[PDB]
């Protein structure tokens, strides 16, 4: 049960508030027992000598004894649950942040193991099952323990045997039942958690791609498998309900046995006298009422077969090391940046063949180069290595005659801007979907930069307060590319990485975009990865096939002269 230890240590910040709960619990349990015990004893003892000889003075037992037990029984309970709950959620939310932080600094190959449909389950629905741990696990046990000892010690003053019998029966039940009801709950909770995660993942995967499923008629199979994986979850829930019902029945039977034993045994005298009188009533009533405190003890321990699984999942999620690591206080931004790649060798994880070997290049003080290649040749892998996603397994990647590693996250992520070939539309306001580049900016530069790229149709009607992405307006296939280009010019930066502009645009729009890009980027350095051989007047042309530079021409002229590669690339094959 060591999986529950780290999450049980979150008491150093809310110790007093949670301890007040257990104090109030023992107080209200004591009041609840005392009310019935005193009422029974008064009703029994007012009838023996109450007919004549009114010497049992009246105005102490009902007034002080009972009216003081009808308030504490209620006011004790209401303040007990109102405080503790307030603490518990105040912890849970904190966890919901902490895990999220540990999920941030691993985008590539880090979260590629876990399916993205169940990480949401771990974050949301697997942190809401610890409220049982923070509410029911601790307080009932100590409350029942203290109440049982207090009652037994109080009753031991008269006829040790009876009080010892009652206390022993209560202690035996308390120490026996939870260890016996933990067992089946273990397996049932494990199945519950696993099946809930699987069902959520499958349901999420069923959507986000309904179009292809429904066009090709492949939805009935997935629906059938969804129902199949839900049936077992329902069955396990039924098993849990059955176990709970059996627990309640056993509690009732134990209470009946205790009541019967205490009633029958207290006949020959509860302490001498061979005929007690008015004491059997209190002894019966105390046993009758004492088990309402012990009733909820087993429901707290039975449900520990589900909390452990969630704790294990969260612990696994929060204990993964990163793969990059950053230095400190090395920002020192500049205006002119060069680039040097002496040797680069990379092998993707879990793979066995190098996807990028033997690459060397040098870009000097704001050049303009474009690289060409086959459909698959590791050209987008080269770009993603310059933003420190993975770590090269050989060679060096210099930057302005300085190692890339000796640069903190506030600098490498500042003088680098990228335009990836897979754009994402965040479900947020257009003003918030475009302020990622430059958070400060203004509300006027946004319109100006949105008008030159050529959109001119989004800042209308509602305008910059419209809701884009899912749940709102969805952009087309070219507007997405234009928006990706637009949120790469506000960021500025002296080094731009255009992964693949103009993929899904017509001739006129692409021409306008090319003219704009050429005009605005003049003092910077551009590394283009293009498939259209359109307007190649750059200062360096580079071609790749599998790993290395086939020809580093850099003039666009001798390729038309030397009948090598790129000579057949544009004529046709």
């Amino acid at each position: 049960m060591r999986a529950l230890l780290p999450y049980l240590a979150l008491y150093k910040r809310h110790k007093w508030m949670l301890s007040l709960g257990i104090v109030l619990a023992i107080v209200t349990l004591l009041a609840s027992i005392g009310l019935l015990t005193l009422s029974g004893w008064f009703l029994s003892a007012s009838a023996v000598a109450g007919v004549a000889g009114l010497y049992s003075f009246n105005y102490m037992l009902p007034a002080a004894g009972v009216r003081g037990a009808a308030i504490t029984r209620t006011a004790g309970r209401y303040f007990e649950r109102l405080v503790s709950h307030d603490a518990t959620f105040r912890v849970l939310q904190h966890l919901r942040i902490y895990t999220f932080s540990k999920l941030l600094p691993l985008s590539p190959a880090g979260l590629a193991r876990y399916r993205q449909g169940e990480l949401l389950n771990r974050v949301v629905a697997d942190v809401d099952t610890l409220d049982h741990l923070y509410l029911r696990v601790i307080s009932p046990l100590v409350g029942a323990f203290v109440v049982i000892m207090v009652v037994t010690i109080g009753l031991s003053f008269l006829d040790f045997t009876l009080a010892f019998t009652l206390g022993g029966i209560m202690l035996l039940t308390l120490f026996l039942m939870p260890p016996l009801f933990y067992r089946a709950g273990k397996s049932t909770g494990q199945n519950l958690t696993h099946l809930r995660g699987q069902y959520r993942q499958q349901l999420t995967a069923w959507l986000q791609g309904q179009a292809e499923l429904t066009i090709f008629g492949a939805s009935d199979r997935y629906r059938t498998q969804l129902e199949n994986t839900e049936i077992q979850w329902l069955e396990a829930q039924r098993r849990q309900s059955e176990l709970t019902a059996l627990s309640q029945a056993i509690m009732l039977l134990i209470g009946a046995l205790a009541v019967i034993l205490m009633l029958w045994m207290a006949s020959g005298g509860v302490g001498g006298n061979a005929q007690p009188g008015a004491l059997i009533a209190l002894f019966v009533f105390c046993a009758l009422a004492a088990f309402e405190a012990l009733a909820p003890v087993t429901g707290a321990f039975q449900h520990l077969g589900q909390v452990i699984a969630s704790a294990v999942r969260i612990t696994d999620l929060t204990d993964q090391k990163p793969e990059v690591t950053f230095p400190d206080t090395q920002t020192r931004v500049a205006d002119r940046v060069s680039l040097t790649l002496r040797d680069v060798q990379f092998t993707y994880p879990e793979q066995s063949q190098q996807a990028l070997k033997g690459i060397s290049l040098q870009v000097n003080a704001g050049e303009h180069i474009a690289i060409l290649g086959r459909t698959g040749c590791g050209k987008s892998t080269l770009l993603q290595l310059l933003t420190r996603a993975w770590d090269p397994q050989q060679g060096e990647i210099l930057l302005n005659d300085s190692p890339i590693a000796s640069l903190n996250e506030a600098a490498l992520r500042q003088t680098i801007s990228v335009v990836p070939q897979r754009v994402h539309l965040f479900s947020a306001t257009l003003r918030d979907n475009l302020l990622l580049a430059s958070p400060g900016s203004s509300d006027e530069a946004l319109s100006e930069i949105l008008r030159r790229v050529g959109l001119e149709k989004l800042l209308e009607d509602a305008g910059l307060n419209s809701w884009l992405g899912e749940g709102g307006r969805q952009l087309s296939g070219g507007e997405l590319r234009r928006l990706a280009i637009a949120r790469a010019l506000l960021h500025d930066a002296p080094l731009v990485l255009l992964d693949q502009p103009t993929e899904g645009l017509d001739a006129t729009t692409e021409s306008q975009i090319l003219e704009l890009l050429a005009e605005m980027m003049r003092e910077k350095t551009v590394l283009m990865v293009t498939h259209r051989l359109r307007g190649l007047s750059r200062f360096q042309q580079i071609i790749v096939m599998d790993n290395g530079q086939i020809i580093e021409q850099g003039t666009h002229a001798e390729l038309l002269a030397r009948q090598g590669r790129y000579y057949q690339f544009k004529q046709g094959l």
């Binding site: 009310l35 009703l43 009808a70 309640q248 029945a249 039977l253 879990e350 698959g376 996603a389 992520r413």
Partner: protein, 588 residues
């Protein structure tokens, strides 16, 4: 959420108990039997105690009632077990049925209505909102009659001994409903607001998780934490707000029950002493009546507290039923769901006059299109970006709502029995994604029983087997989350192979040569031309080279078509087409 909305939601929730009233009746009967048994036990215990205390009679003469008390206890335990099991089963059945209905409607909806909310919101609505009605459907409904029935029997059994205690209980009884109806509405509204906040949080988290690459490359590692913190605070506040009302109601009920118990005990204690002597049937008061009343009163009050506890579960169910009821009353694309089959084979012909394709909100994405594709042939759409070509393809597929046009073979497209209609299409899509797990399953998504034509399909579209002897396993490679195992240009060929496996009668080709080099695009184009020559096609190609023998060219922009001609007659002075071709040829 006004009073009328709550009434409508309550009626809708009550509608679904028809298939479980059969077990609700059994639950009510079992509760009634338990209520009888507990009274019997109380009477037995009271008689035993009076005989034991007053007359000092030895145990042996009271050997009879002990066995009856034991039997009553055993019977009570058995009854409670059976009642709990029956209640749970009756609760589960209705949730199963409701989830089946919701999934059916969601499948019938389509891909345009699904994007109305993020997938996280859909998952939360399907799981939590459906699962949170179990308490209402299992506990509250049987208890609504038990809380009326059992106290009446208890007070009736108490009556024939001393009317004062019964009068006290009857006077104390009516106060509870007046004090739960004062917080019911607040609970019912707070529940809905809390559920809305939870759905918002889940959707935000899922959407942020999907696009982590942009956040990393742009360095936004601080604002997202702030947004998550705000969402968590908004969730926590509503949760505390509903729990506070629940606690207050429970405390008030407990206080009143305790006060009534104290009053009854005080009266019975004072009566024996000869101080009050007002309530009796002129025969005094005995210990048996007092003990019986003392034992029975808390059990008289318990069902009312149970009803007060289950009222908040009912409020939770009412609040949860607000989000999934509105969605179940929103019109779909075509609100008829027609029924007709357009035979088989019989080469198609798409003809439309004045077709205005709308949006799932009410906007307009097209204009007065007038066209007719005669008995096969091939059609290409070329024009300025942002005109509505993909909207036309979606309307032809059947994911949007049109207005009075687009009939095929003389039959309107509105009543073609969608399940039968979608069998004649071989979609290719723009920016495709792989929804399966293994690379072999995606290429076999149409006809999953074939092992020889798979190789021919993978070799005809070509260049999908060129990278096959490079993956770790082979044709059974477990592709990544979206497409992480493959690149961008290697998924287009997979989609093309998927679209070319089996014959069809209508081929809606989106842009097939996306992110491809010259050789690969040329081979895929040759394969697609060979496949397309055999039946009706519709292409939205974006390059103005090699279209000399495509039979028809439709230049379209601003959501309408101006020029519908041929390559020879449109390459001389054909307005916008000439300008586009000139730009394309001069830029090279």
């Amino acid at each position: 959420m006004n009073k009328s909305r709550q009434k409508e939601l309550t009626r809708w929730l009550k509608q679904q108990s028809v298939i479980s009233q059969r077990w609700l009746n059994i639950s009510r009967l079992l509760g009634f039997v338990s209520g009888i048994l507990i009274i019997a036990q109380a009477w037995f215990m009271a008689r035993i105690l009076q005989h034991m205390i007053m007359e000092n009679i030895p145990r042996e003469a009271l050997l009879l009632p002990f066995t009856l008390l034991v039997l009553t206890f055993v019977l009570r335990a058995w009854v409670v077990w059976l009642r709990e099991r029956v209640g749970y089963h009756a609760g589960q059945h209705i949730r199963f049925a409701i989830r089946r209905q919701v999934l059916d409607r969601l499948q019938q909806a389509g891909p345009a209505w699904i994007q109305g909310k993020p997938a996280g919101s859909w998952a939360t609505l399907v799981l939590e909102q459906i699962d949170d009605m179990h308490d209402y459907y299992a506990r509250y409904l049987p208890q609504m009659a038990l809380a009326v029935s059992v106290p009446l029997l208890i007070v009736v059994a108490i009556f024939p001994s001393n009317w004062a205690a019964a009068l006290i209980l009857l006077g104390t009884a009516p106060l509870i409903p007046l004090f739960m109806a004062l917080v019911g509405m607040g609970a019912a509204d707070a529940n809905r607001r809390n559920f809305l906040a939870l759905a918002r949080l889940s959707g935000h988290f899922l959407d942020r998780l999907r696009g982590m690459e942009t956040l990393r490359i742009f360095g936004r590692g601080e604002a997202e934490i702030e947004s998550i913190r705000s969402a968590s605070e908004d969730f926590r506040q509503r949760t505390m707000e509903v729990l506070r009302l629940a606690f207050l109601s429970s405390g008030i009920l407990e206080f009143f029950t305790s006060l009534s118990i104290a009053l009854v005990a005080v009266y019975f204690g004072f009566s024996y002493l000869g101080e009050l002597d007002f309530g009796h049937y002129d025969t005094g008061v005995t210990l048996a009546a007092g003990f019986l009343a003392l034992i029975l009163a808390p059990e008289f009050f318990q069902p009312l507290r149970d009803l007060g506890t289950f009222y908040h579960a009912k409020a939770q169910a009412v609040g949860a039923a607000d989000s999934l009821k509105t969605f179940m009353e929103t019109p779909l694309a075509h609100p008829q769901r027609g029924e007709a089959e357009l035979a088989l084979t019989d080469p198609l012909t798409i003809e439309a006059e004045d077709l205005f394709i709308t949006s799932p909100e009410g906007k307009t994405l097209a204009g007065p299109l007038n066209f007719t594709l005669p008995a096969g042939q091939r059609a290409v759409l070329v024009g300025r970006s942002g005109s509505g070509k993909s909207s036309l393809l979606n309307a032809l597929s059947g994911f949007l709502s049109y207005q009075g046009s687009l009939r095929i073979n003389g039959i309107e497209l509105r009543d073609l029995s969608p399940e039968s209609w979608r069998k004649h299409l071989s979609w290719v899509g723009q920016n495709p994604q792989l929804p399966a797990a293994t690379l072999r399953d995606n290429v076999l998504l149409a006809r999953p029983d074939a092992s020889e034509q798979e190789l021919q399909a993978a070799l005809d579209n070509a260049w999908v087997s060129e990278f096959l002897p490079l993956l770790p396993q082979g044709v059974d490679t477990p592709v990544g989350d979206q497409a992480a195992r493959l690149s961008v240009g290697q998924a287009q060929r997979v989609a093309v192979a998927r679209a070319l496996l089996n014959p069809c009668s209508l081929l809606l080709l989106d842009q097939p040569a996306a992110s491809l080099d010259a050789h690969s695009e040329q081979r895929v184009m040759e394969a697609l031309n060979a496949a397309s020559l055999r039946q009706t096609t519709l292409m939205v190609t974006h390059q103005l080279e090699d279209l000399a023998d495509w039979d028809v060219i439709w230049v379209m922009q601003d959501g309408r078509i101006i020029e519908q001609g041929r390559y020879a007659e449109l390459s001389v002075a054909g307005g916008p087409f000439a300008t586009l071709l000139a730009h394309r040829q001069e830029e090279i």
